[model samples]
Target: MIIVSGQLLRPQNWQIDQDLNPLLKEMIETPVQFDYHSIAELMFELKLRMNIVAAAKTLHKSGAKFATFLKTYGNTTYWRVSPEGALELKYRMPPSKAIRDIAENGPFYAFECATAIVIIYYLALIDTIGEDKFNASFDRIILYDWHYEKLPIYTETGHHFFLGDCLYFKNPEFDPQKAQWRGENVILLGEDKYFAHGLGILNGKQIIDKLNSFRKKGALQSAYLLSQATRLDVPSLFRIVR
Candidate 1:
């Protein structure tokens, strides 16, 4: 299999033009936008203000969690899950290991933008331009919650394995405190050919849309949109062929 881990915020060695060398010149010129930070700010507001889910319900957990997180660490709550079932929390500071850290954070920023832009465009092109037209943009999409238990294992043990792309938001048994985040952003897949890599392949798009859904609903606001304009240069596995 081919794995592509990148820090989208600032890609160092992966030349965009070189990596996507075979794409048409016109495809390379396509313009896209990344206004997710605008949405992020909104999320920060709701997450910090404790009003994301209040129909005036007086949910203080939102505000409390936001405050505690900010006071303790410089980061906001990127992903949150209650202690109910097999919620596999990732390795303690998975981003600390040089290899894991680089892979995870590499596309941290750029993936956000590329993901967001792809979703917006994909929705518009679904009925117009069709799936084949869209899948050619990006093939190996993936996603995850911050909660991971151990390093993920990808074995070739004839396991009949597949990666999970969609965040399974089974409406858990509700406790006012636990069910705070009930709403999930909608996910739209282009077609079946994009299926071999499994649903996780479409996760980048899912996250972008999910965040956007919050912003449009006035639930969150990101100051910047992490949108990127890139074209597919080759078929799946072609980069590794020699």
Candidate 2:
């Protein structure tokens, strides 16, 4: 069982083999829209999918690779070898310089829920954000972090869901007593779905319904509206020239 926005959810079918090395020949069937040119890029994307479908307690620092990290920390509680001969661990990952800093700094062994890690990894992967800039701004970032940097931004409260928009939910479990507004975050997907580590690509309405069914509590919120939002003030250092 996995928990998102205070509601427990079953793991969604992540689009990757849950194995550590040489990806399963039969499982690498999904087609990625992004044109990846290098094996490293493929590995990064694979690791991203791995992180999204993993459990929360198995948190990995941003930018760490599944194979590299596994070789070193596979024996720890955060990682384990599944009975099916697949690698399983707490959710994690990110970019290059970001990876190094995470290792050199103490944030190496930290947990950042779903929002921060996903958004950072997505932006970095697309080359819209740099590792250093991301780390520098992460502490001050949130669901609408892209808005601050003038990247394509959007939000429609509860009316619209963009393919890659970050989602912010005011769940009942975070702050059950008052209106503090503490909650969870997820990246929106097509078909009323969203992605987050430990939960993967889950049905949007199902999660909402589950939250509401719990005595009609919790709600979704948006900081900025995302209706066909696009980048405007992209920084050179942050832009992906490739």
Candidate 3:
């Protein structure tokens, strides 16, 4: 159920165009009941969400490995992985092209789960707003662990987890030596499956099991999913770019 401006936006009134607005089409069918200031705002968020869903799926199939900054690898053409392990877009490289290189030439890029989430988010934004808007908004793009400025993915503790939401699997007893396994940031792709970078598309139990394997000695707690959503700042972007 999608509510807009205090009224329910019924599925029959979804307003999909004759050619079919994939954004609108995909959103009205979601399982969660989301509230929107208006139908326009709903549509904007829907577009971003759908793009994120697609991007997450594409990335999981792209063969990108998971690695921490200490062992990260990336294609040298479009990105320069700093000594500190941040993926810096090459000068003058269109953000769209660089994002494409990671998905299409996935074997060349290896990053931690958080960086992978960032890449998926960027790719989704590029798809949602078109390449021109993305390039115009940001001159520099860096892939690092939650160190980005300007546009950011906002996380919230909430009960409403929707498709395209980024959630986490926490490993409370993770081995200190394997900090990368402390948690897995995953994109909810629906169907009880999540796309976890370096872990591939897997069910919650599978992800939890894998994380448990990396736990410290005498660990008692199981890896568990956090009830939170790392979602795009849709309202801000809608105001800025749309």
Candidate 4:
């Protein structure tokens, strides 16, 4: 059962096995329009919507866990995945570097993700503001990567703490505009921790409001990080349905 504003929604299907790896690679790497629709269609073909919705509901709950958005749809099809595989509802992603790291992978991965996210945000924000404004905002988006001069923490952590995941940069503080990053060594909440998902979603509204502030002041990493949390992980990524 999935919950939205206290109501439960059971989706009919969800799966994405067709051209799985390549399709996902493209979706994750490129700035293709209707990418979410293409992925959702594939999930429908695979019959996995219910599982994804269930996951979204769980993640959206006030205190359950694991949240994500199906698309950066502005106000539609965004939800959460419960630790118990339940689903919840919300808008915008949470802005914690931990959550971003789990999704970014490595340098190339962060680059691609930052690229995709900027594009998504660009499109979604257009309807609210005018095209001219959107373009200006787009220009301000900073592309994050694991470059040493910019985001030097990726190497220092490798030297000092032996916490070398070779992937920790994805978990660091990154500045896309300036192309800088800093590694953070903190106790991480588990990917599957239910309450953590709930906390993120619960905190999502606050994050989104703050992220919107960037449009005027030339945004930075802090608030935008929280806004990223509002997104639901791909239904295809999990290969599940409502």
Question: Which candidate wins on lDDT?
Answer: 3
Q: Each model's TM-score, in the order given?
A: 0.18, 0.34, 0.87, 0.20
Candidate 4 segments whose C-alpha is farther than 4 A from its true place: 1-50, 59-196, 200-205, 208-221, 225-242
Order of candidate numbers by TM-score, starting with the best = 3, 2, 4, 1
Error of 2 at 236 (Å): 9.8
Which candidate comes out best when scored by TM-score?
3
Pitting candidate 2 against candidate 4, the one with the higher lDDT is 2
Clashing pairs in 3: none
| Candidate 2 per-residue lDDT over residues 1-242, each given as its tens digit | 22233443322344554452323221243231233344444444444433332321122333333221222222232333444322233244333333334333423333233323433443443333345545444423222122243233333333433233455554544335532224436554434555544344566565554344333234343222223322121222223322
Model 1 misplaced regions, further than 4 Å: 1-17, 23-27, 31-91, 96-242
| Candidate models: Cα lDDT each | 0.24, 0.36, 0.81, 0.27
Give the CA lDDT, 0 to 100, for residue 57 in model 1.
18
RMSD to native, candidate 3: 3.1
| Worst ten in a row by lDDT for model 2 | 229-238
What's the CA RMSD of model 1 in angstroms? 20.4
Clashing pairs in 2: 58-90, 58-91, 63-93, 63-94, 154-225, 154-226, 155-224, 155-225, 155-226
lDDT of 4 by residue, 1-242 (tens): 22234332333334535433333333334332223334334433223222222222322331211222322111113334434322223333322221222233222121122222222222222322345543433322232211111111112211211000111212123344423222211111222121112123223234334334333233343532211122223333323222
lDDT of 3 by residue, 160-194 (tens): 67778899999999999988789888998875789
